[PDB]
Structure 1
Amino acid sequence: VNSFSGYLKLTDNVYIKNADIVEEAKKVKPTVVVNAANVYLKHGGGVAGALNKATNNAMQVESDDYIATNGPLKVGGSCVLSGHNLAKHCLHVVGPNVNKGEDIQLLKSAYENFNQHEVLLAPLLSAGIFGADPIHSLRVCVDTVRTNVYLAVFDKNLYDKLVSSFL
């Protein structure tokens, strides 16, 4: 038993809710919150901008030190940093950005990072400003992630579509 509340169960291990991931993180304090990161960990907008804003820019300060030491992530890759006031840890995962021409097949590799964590609160990778089809992202999630994932979908209209079209 865990503290996540109000989720619709899609599969044995995947759950989904219409929620603001920032508000959900502040209430649950999960072990892991997933950020929709880019390779530079520049948290300017979308999920990343909202998570970073909720940390009062501490996420960005930590991220800049990470990049200065390690260089950029790979598309499809990830790193574990602090969750600040939102979670114990933040798993920064780089899904392919369609608006940059990145290969959508890398979406499966991106979701594989979730398997290193027993339970996660996460957004749909490559959705929103990353330009992928969220229905496709949900399908890849269900077919790739084997650990317990609680998906927060900000847009109510999208949440209902995602639910109604789920196979």
Structure 2
Amino acid sequence: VNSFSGYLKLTDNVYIKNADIVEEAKKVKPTVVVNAANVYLKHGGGVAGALNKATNNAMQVESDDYIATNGPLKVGGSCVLSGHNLAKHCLHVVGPNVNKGEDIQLLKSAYENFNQHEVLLAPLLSAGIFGADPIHSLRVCVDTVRTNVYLAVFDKNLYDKLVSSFL
């Protein structure tokens, strides 16, 4: 038993809720919150800009040092950094960005990063301003992630559609 509240059970291990992921993180203080990152860890908008704003830009400062030392991530890759005031850790995961013309197939590789963590609070990878179909992202999530994932979906109308169309 954990502290996530009001989630809907989709499968044995995947749960979903209409909520702002930053607000969920503040309340639950999960061990791991997932960021919808890009390879440069430039957190300007969407989930990434949201999480970074809530950290008062500390996430961006830490990320800039990470990139200066290690260089960019790979599309489909990830790194673990601090969760600051939101979580113990932030797993920065890079899903493909269709609006950048990136390869849709890398979405499964991106979700495989979640399997390294027993429990995560996460967004749907490649959705929103990354350009992919959220219904597809949810399908790849359920078919790839074996650990316990609590998905926060910002948009109410999208949430309702994700639940109603889930196979």
Q: Which position in structure 2 is the counterpart of 1:62?
A: 62
TM-score, length-scaled by structure 2: 1.00
Q: Which position in structure 1 is the counterpart of 2:146?
A: 146
2:5 aligned counterpart, secondary structure: coil
Per-residue CA distance 1:28-70 (angstroms, 9 max, x = gap): 0000000000000000000000000000000000000000000
Name segments (4+ residues, structure 1) moved above 6 Å.
Answer: none
Q: 2: CA distance between counterparts of 1:28 and 1:92?
A: 19
Per-residue CA distance 1:102-144 (angstroms, 9 max, x = gap): 1000000000000000000000000000000000000000000
State the 1:75 CA deviation.
0.0
Q: 1: CA distance between counterparts of 2:62 and 2:68?
A: 10
Query: How big is the alpha-carbon RMSD for the aligned residues of Structure 1 and Structure 2?
Result: 0.2
Structure 1: stretches of 5+ with no match in the other structure: none
State the 1:76 CA deviation.
0.0
Q: 2: CA distance between counterparts of 1:39 and 1:119?
A: 24
How many residue pairs align between the two structures?
Answer: 167
TM-score, length-scaled by structure 1: 1.00
Structure 2: stretches of 5+ with no match in the other structure: none
